[PDB]
């Protein structure tokens, strides 16, 4: 950082780790004659590797906040410095343990989250909480506004990954083809919306190769001993398999009318907890002096937020952009006049340190690109956005109807 310039707090966005896929459905088993893989937890856990994994990025956090003078450079942090709040979910509770444990081993820290495990955090899910609802017919134009195009005409666009796609699941001899073969013919894109508007799904091809993609990707980050039954050979096919996955979350997270209705809370959160002078529901029992919030949520959480703020990004390494234990970073940085600035950094994992469950040092670090937000027109050109003008981004970009009451 530039000389007089001092780190005051973080505020850490992850996605939880690696787990087992959330579903299995009838549709993914039929597309492939092969046999998916047994995963060792429940569906939707994550695994105990996903939990060693988080916990290697609690290590590298440890080093680069310790660096910058924000945790002591050995032993405890003290226990307001450092506060999780964890969505509900086992996969999500269990990241935020597993990162007290990498950042903080053997110190008595513990986790925070809603009471009540069996309903939304509306945090995390203000929409599905009924805390806001979207109008149907303003997704789909929305929706189609971001894709450019009709989106029944998607597939068009993703010809090539579709096609690998299909060779890989080896869908012409699957059950599917024995029943109904193209894959991208077979399964046109179609925006799927429930009566209330509140349950939104991509259809068809690209959104199914989504979340095999992913899923492949899973079995990698797992180190599972067979990925895709084999069929995925080089950077080139991981790359082009996980577009679909990126393309899928771009049009149903990243979309601004829909990242603002599921991300209005999240955002003003990390705003208020970055110093701007608004109202957000407190997290119960945080500290005034804390310097360090870490939020475990899911990948849409962060595809959401970086609609919002217009922020986007590919990972040198990660073919994912909102990988297992990826989180976006913030920073609260003042410099020697104490004037505040915003820093955001995407900090991940590459494929290659998931699969071979690197250490994470400063020597040997974690992937990390310094994001441009295109609307904070005064942030500097290595990276500084003034306070004044994120927060006034922030204002903008919020849904009203979905802050929390
Ligand atoms: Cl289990
Ligand atoms: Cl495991
Ligand atoms: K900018
Ligand atoms: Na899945």
């Known amino acids: 950082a530039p000389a007089g310039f001092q780190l005051e707090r973080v505020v850490i966005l992850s996605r939880h780790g690696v787990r087992a896929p959330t579903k299995m459905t009838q549709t993914m088993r039929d597309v492939t004659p092969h046999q998916w893989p047994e995963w060792p937890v429940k569906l939707g ?48 509770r269990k990241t935020g343990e597993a990162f007290l444990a990498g950042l903080a081993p053997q110190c008595d820290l513990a986790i925070h989250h809603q009471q009540n495990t069996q309903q939304a955090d509306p945090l995390f899910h203000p929409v599905k909480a009924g805390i806001c609802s979207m109008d149907k017919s303003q997704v789909h134009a929305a929706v189609e506004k971001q894709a450019g195009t009709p989106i029944e005409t998607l597939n068009q666009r993703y010809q090539a990954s579709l096609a690998l796609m299909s ?113 957000s529901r407190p997290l119960p029992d945080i500290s005034p002096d ?40 913030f920073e609260r940085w003042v410099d020697n006049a104490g004037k505040p600035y915003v820093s955001v950094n995407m900090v991940y994992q590459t494929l290659a340190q998931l699969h071979d469950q690197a ?32 927060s006034r981004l922030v204002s903008h970009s919020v849904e009203p109807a979905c802050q929390l009451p």
């Not at 609609?307 to 989180?327: F, I, R, S, V, Y």
Request: with cysteine; net charge negative; proline share 8%.
């Open 167 to 279: 060779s890989v699941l080896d869908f012409p001899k699957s059950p599917y083809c024995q029943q109904h073969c193209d894959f991208s013919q077979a399964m046109p894109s179609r925006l799927a919306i429930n009566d209330d508007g509140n349950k939104v799904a991509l259809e068809g091809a690209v959104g199914l190769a989504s979340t095999l993609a992913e899923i492949f990707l899973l079995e990698h980050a797992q180190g599972m001993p067979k990925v895709a039954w084999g069929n995925i050979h080089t950077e080139q096919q991981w790359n082009s398999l996980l577009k679909l996955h990126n393309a899928q979350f771009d049009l149903m997270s990243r979309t601004p009318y829909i990242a603002k209705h599921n991300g209005t809370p999240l955002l003003q959160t990390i705003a208020h907890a970055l110093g701007s002078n608004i109202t």
């Open 359 to 390: 250490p994470l040092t400063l020597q040997h670090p974690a992937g990390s690109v310094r994001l441009n937000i295109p609307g904070c027109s005064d942030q500097t050109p290595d990276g500084y956005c003034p306070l004044s003008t994120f």
């Open 45 to 92: 856990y994550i695994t105990p590797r996903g939990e060693h994994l988080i916990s290697l990025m609690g290590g590298f956090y440890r080093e680069r906040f310790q660096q910058q003078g924000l945790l002591p450079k050995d032993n405890c942090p003290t226990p307001d410095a450092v506060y999780v709040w964890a969505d509900v979910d086992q996969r999500t």
């Open 290 to 329: 804390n310097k360090i919030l870490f939020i475990a949520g899911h990948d849409t959480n962060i595809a959401n937020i970086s609609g919002m703020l217009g922020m986007t990004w590919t990972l040198p390494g990660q073919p994912d952009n909102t990988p297992p234990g990826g989180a976006l970073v």
